[PDB]
Structure formats: structure tokens, C-alpha cells
Design an enzyme around this catalytic site. Structure first.
Site, mmCIF file in Angstrom:
data_model
loop_
_atom_site.group_PDB
_atom_site.id
_atom_site.type_symbol
_atom_site.label_atom_id
_atom_site.label_comp_id
_atom_site.label_asym_id
_atom_site.label_seq_id
_atom_site.Cartn_x
_atom_site.Cartn_y
_atom_site.Cartn_z
ATOM 1 N N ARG A 1 0.158 31.363 13.142
ATOM 2 C CA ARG A 1 -0.643 30.296 13.637
ATOM 3 C C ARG A 1 -1.961 29.907 12.691
ATOM 4 N NH1 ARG A 1 -0.531 34.127 18.521
ATOM 5 N NH2 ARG A 1 1.050 33.207 19.904
ATOM 6 N N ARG A 2 -1.522 30.103 11.169
ATOM 7 C CA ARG A 2 -2.403 29.881 10.348
ATOM 8 C C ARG A 2 -1.827 29.284 9.126
ATOM 9 N NH1 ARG A 2 -3.482 33.801 5.992
ATOM 10 N NH2 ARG A 2 -2.773 35.606 6.590
ATOM 11 N N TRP A 5 -8.939 5.517 -6.927
ATOM 12 C CA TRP A 5 -9.846 6.441 -7.365
ATOM 13 C C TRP A 5 -10.716 5.938 -8.534
ATOM 14 C CZ3 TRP A 5 -11.306 10.937 -4.920
ATOM 15 C CH2 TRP A 5 -10.445 11.415 -3.854
ATOM 16 N N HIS A 12 -14.988 5.109 13.030
ATOM 17 C CA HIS A 12 -15.908 4.147 13.276
ATOM 18 C C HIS A 12 -15.100 2.696 12.717
ATOM 19 C CE1 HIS A 12 -16.376 6.285 9.279
ATOM 20 N NE2 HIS A 12 -16.335 4.842 8.808
ATOM 21 N N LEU A 13 -15.484 1.645 13.067
ATOM 22 C CA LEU A 13 -15.128 0.224 12.818
ATOM 23 C C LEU A 13 -16.509 -0.573 12.398
ATOM 24 C CD1 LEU A 13 -12.807 -2.018 13.170
ATOM 25 C CD2 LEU A 13 -13.726 -2.211 15.579
ATOM 26 N N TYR A 20 -9.135 16.749 -3.991
ATOM 27 C CA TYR A 20 -8.149 17.081 -3.078
ATOM 28 C C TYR A 20 -7.245 18.145 -3.907
ATOM 29 C CZ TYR A 20 -9.353 13.964 0.594
ATOM 30 O OH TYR A 20 -10.059 13.242 1.672
ATOM 31 N N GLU A 60 -0.473 8.579 -4.964
ATOM 32 C CA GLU A 60 -1.750 9.443 -4.510
ATOM 33 C C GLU A 60 -1.197 10.756 -4.080
ATOM 34 O OE1 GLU A 60 -4.261 9.023 -0.980
ATOM 35 O OE2 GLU A 60 -5.822 9.015 -2.486
ATOM 36 N N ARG A 69 -12.797 14.135 9.107
ATOM 37 C CA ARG A 69 -14.391 14.181 9.498
ATOM 38 C C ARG A 69 -14.732 12.904 9.524
ATOM 39 N NH1 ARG A 69 -17.553 12.672 5.347
ATOM 40 N NH2 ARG A 69 -16.786 12.267 3.226
ATOM 41 N N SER A 70 -14.107 12.026 8.816
ATOM 42 C CA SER A 70 -14.642 10.308 8.811
ATOM 43 C C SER A 70 -13.510 9.451 8.618
ATOM 44 C CB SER A 70 -15.924 10.154 7.659
ATOM 45 O OG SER A 70 -16.666 9.040 8.072
ATOM 46 N N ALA A 71 -13.624 8.479 9.407
ATOM 47 C CA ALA A 71 -12.367 7.411 9.277
ATOM 48 C C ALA A 71 -12.906 5.954 9.546
ATOM 49 C CB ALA A 71 -11.265 7.973 10.038
ATOM 50 N N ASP A 72 -12.623 5.106 8.605
ATOM 51 C CA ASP A 72 -12.775 3.780 8.893
ATOM 52 C C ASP A 72 -11.500 3.353 9.676
ATOM 53 O OD1 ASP A 72 -13.914 1.129 8.807
ATOM 54 O OD2 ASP A 72 -12.721 0.648 7.239
ATOM 55 N N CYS A 112 -12.662 13.511 2.763
ATOM 56 C CA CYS A 112 -12.425 12.933 4.361
ATOM 57 C C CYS A 112 -11.363 13.634 5.087
ATOM 58 C CB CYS A 112 -12.072 11.364 4.297
ATOM 59 S SG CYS A 112 -13.363 10.492 3.284
ATOM 60 N N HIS A 164 0.952 -1.311 0.038
ATOM 61 C CA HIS A 164 -0.069 -0.108 -0.106
ATOM 62 C C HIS A 164 0.836 1.253 -0.074
ATOM 63 C CE1 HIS A 164 -3.192 -2.662 0.510
ATOM 64 N NE2 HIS A 164 -3.518 -2.743 1.936
#
Lengths: 275, 260
Positions: free
Chosen positions: B138-139, B76, B219-220, B99, B54, B178-181, B158, B47
Site C-alpha cells: 500500500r505504499r 523547460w 483552474h481555468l 522531478y 520529457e 497540486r495545481s493544474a491548468d 506540480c 505534443h
């Protein structure tokens, strides 16, 4: 020993961590800082409202400022009409001239990002209404698709972050629904742990309660995440004093239950009461 | 130590995760000291090739999949078919404002034919200059999130936003996901952004600090419960090697990036 309630314990743990473990920045001139990069705190909103060290008198200004953001307004007059001075410093003619804009206009700060993200400018000098209303989309998505993994509001447009006095420090936030309870996480790019963090936590916890009510949900957790999380050296002593202070009482939010629309809250609909 | 933070996350989701199947928590954070080793976690060496290619594709600002497909990277492909691109009025292989567009050309306008002008904001070029000239900013932020466009792509980004930080000439990075397996996505994305941190650190003449992973919906899936449980019992970080001659973030080639 002082037995602080959970929310204040988490906040004081952050102050202590920065004081003890933060890296040092600054040279021989200008106020230095101690800081860490990346921090996270969780506040169960069913266990009291996280007012933290915010004086009750200042909660008025937190409420009115949030209503201003929700209206999409970036002109200071609404705040001044309500005797809220939070943004006055950046709305003077001297300050607005730094960005080529008229007195009272803050530029594309939170109200614009939340209600009209990415809108284009009209020849009359105002924004067209062709941006994205993130608040309206969010409420609709919570009601119709609560398991959405993109219940997001962003304050960050790189084309505009450099066009305001304070590039948005409350950079992006996300909601989450589980067991009919609404949680929220805030990503804060820059956090003054002494002067800013308590106010910001109260603001977003309040917003979470307001959105939960209008969507018919209970409240879950507010999760605060920091990027550059710092304490200025002229506040080290005051921070140490906060660490040794007697515990503050628990309090809870009380909202007018008749408000059904996120844009229909008024200042008098929102109060702090005893837990 | 890197695997311990990740195993702790698995244990947390298994124990205290809410059920919806998936078990999930909202709001989590892990820290990896990049000086201790590269946080490859559970991503197999196979991988890593796809991770590198990518990331180079992201950095080019390309949103056509040709470069990936030419390099045998198919991650993709499912969203680049004629059927999928037609949903958005786009030609085959054009993913739209994913992206690469956000990173290199945020908020750009479109021609009538749907092709973007290059009048958006190049967040990567700005970032490199800001790290070099104002490292205490700081940005030092790259956002992948345009609400006008998150619904105009098959997969809303994501890896939503990331930020850099400099202390003692060491570069740290924090990713907001925001979201992750947790079983596959999280390790892959940690490797991607830790690699980016090393690449940016080298081009700015800096060492590496921490990579901080922050999750939203984490999440799992039920089909990974048993594998996740046994991963805790299994109980060897690698090292990244970069071609030291590369001094521009857009000049890295696949051959310049190795994992030992």
C-alpha cells in the site's frame, strides 16, 4: 427511511461502495479485503463537523494526538502523560528494537515530518534542527500569500518511510483559500474505511479549523482522497450494521477564540458541541 | 468515456468554479480505464513527442536540460537560462532539484560546488522491485515533493506525488496534482502519467487498470473560457503501442513508444 446528514451520507456511501464494488484480495489464509483504488469525498465544514462514527470519548485522543504532531514530538511520553494510548503499541521496547531505537521513540513519524522535514542526524543520536518546518512555513504563506497553489505539508520522506512501523498513511495534505475560507485536501495512501477513515477525517477537519482561526479565515471544505481504500473481511458485518444504523446528530467544533498561534492550542481549547 | 470525465471537469469549473482571471475548484477526481483506450484527451499528436521525451528525461534523473534541447523539446527552456539558473546559484541549463532528482535521488546531499551526490533515495528503482515482489504493497509511492527544495526551483513540482496499485494483475496509478491548468496542463499530465503506467506495467509483466487523476487547485484561465465552453459541444481515443522487447523501465527510447 433513515435520513443521514451530509457528512455521514458520504461516509456510508463509501462503505457501501467498497462492500458492493470493491475488488477482492487475500488467499485461503489470512483476513481478506475488498478495496478500491482512488476515492474522494467532500465535507463542507460550515455544515457541521465531520465526526462521522467517531465516539465523542475518542475525540479527546484525536485532539491530543494532533497537538503532539504539531509539537514535532515523536516520543510517546506526551501521549501517555495525557492517557492517550493510540501509539503505545509501536513504542514498546520490543517494537522500537525492530528499528534499532530506544523504547518510547516512534522514529520519524508525523511530528518529525511536519516540523523538521529532511533534518540530518547529530552524533548525539538526535535530529539536528536543520530540516524544514512545514507548519510554520504554511501559516506564514496563508497569511501573506493566501492564493498560493503550494500550501502543502508532506508526511512522506522515502528515506524514512521504511524506518517506522507505519509508513505515514496521511501522506500529504494541501490547503486552499477562496472567499476568505480555508479548505484542505488530504491524500491518504492507505485507508481502512472502517477503523481509520473516520478518525483521520476528524483529525484533519480539526486541523483545518485551527489553522483557519489563527489566520483569520472561515472554513471551506475538507476533501478526503484515498489511494488503497479497503475494508477488511472481519468488518463486513459491522460495516453492514453501520449502513443500517439510525442517523447520528449533527455536531460542531468550538475553539477558544483567544488562541492566535497554531502551536498554542491546548486540549481544553477544543470541544465538540451541538450544531 | 475518457473525454466525458474531462468535459465534466470543464463543465464543473465553468458552472460551480470560484472566481479569483481564473475560475477554479479545489479537490477533484477523474478515472480513466486504460483498457478502453489511451487518454490523450485534447493533446495534439505534436505534443505527444514532447510528452514522451520529457518522461524519459524524468526517468533518467537528469535535471540538466541538454537532453531535452538536443531532442528539440523546449518546454523547460524558459527556466534553464543563465539568468534563471543564477537565481539559485546554478550554471546555465541546470534546473536544480526538479522531478528527475526527486524520482531518482530524493534527499541526496550536495558537494561544495552544488553538485548532488547520489546518496538519495531512488524511488523508481525501489518501486519497480516492490511491484514485482510485493504488488499488494500500500505504499507503491513516488513523491516529487521535498519542502527543502520546492522553493529552490523555478517551478515547484506540480505533479506532486503518485501511487500505484495492483488488482488482478492490472496496474493502476493515481496522480496528486497540486495545481493544474485544465485547458493545457491537465491533458498533458494525464497523458504523461498514463504513459508511465503502461511502461511500468509492461516491465512488471502486468496489464493496465485505471489512471486516477486527483487535483488540488484546478483552474481555468479567462482566456480559455470560450474555447472550453465550445469543447463541450464538439463531442476518439487512441491506442498506445510499446516495443514489447523493453523489460527495464530505464531502457525505453523514444522509438519504443507510439500512439496509433
Amino acid at each position: 427511511a433513515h435520513h443521514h446528514h451530509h457528512h455521514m451520507r458520504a461516509y456510508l456511501d463509501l462503505l457501501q461502495h467498497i462492500l458492493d464494488n470493491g475488488g477482492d484480495k487475500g488467499d485461503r489464509t489470512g483476513t481478506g479485503t475488498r478495496s478500491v483504488f482512488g476515492h474522494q469525498m467532500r465535507f463542507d465544514l460550515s455544515k457541521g463537523f465531520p465526526l462521522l462514527t467517531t465516539k465523542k470519548v475518542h475525540f479527546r485522543s484525536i485532539v491530543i494526538e494532533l497537538l503532539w504532531f504539531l509539537k514535532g514530538d515523536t516520543n510517546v511520553k506526551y501521549l501517555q502523560d495525557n492517557k492517550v494510548t493510540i501509539w503505545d503499541e509501536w513504542a514498546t521496547a520490543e517494537q522500537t528494537a525492530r528499528f534499532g531505537r530506544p523504547e518510547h521513540e516512534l522514529g520519524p513519524v508525523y511530528g518529525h515530518q511536519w516540523r523538521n522535514f529532511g533534518a540530518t542526524k547529530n552524533a548525539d543520536g538526535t535530529y539536528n534542527q536543520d530540516g524544514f518546518d512545514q507548519i510554520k512555513w504554511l501559516i506564514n504563506e496563508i497569511k501573506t500569500n493566501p492564493n498560493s497553489r503550494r500550501l502543502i505539508v508532506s508526511g512522506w520522506n522515502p528515506n524514512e518511510a521504511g524506518q517506522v512501523a507505519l509508513p505515514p498513511c496521511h501522506t500529504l495534505f494541501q490547503f486552499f483559500v477562496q472567499d476568505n475560507k480555508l479548505s484542505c485536501q488530504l491524500y491518504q495512501r492507505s485507508a481502512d474505511v472502517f477503523l481509520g477513515v473516520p478518525f483521520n477525517i476528524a483529525s484533519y477537519a480539526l486541523l483545518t479549523h485551527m489553522i483557519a482561526q489563527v489566520c483569520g479565515l472561515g472554513v471551506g471544505d475538507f476533501v478526503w482522497t484515498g489511494g488503497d481504500t479497503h475494508l477488511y473481511a472481519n468488518h463486513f458485518e459491522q460495516a453492514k450494521l453501520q449502513l443500517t444504523r439510525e442517523p447520528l446528530p449533527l455536531c460542531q467544533l468550538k475553539l477558544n477564540p483567544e488562541v492566535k498561534d497554531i502551536f498554542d492550542f491546548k486540549f481544553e481549547d477544543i470541544e465538540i458541541v451541538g450544531y
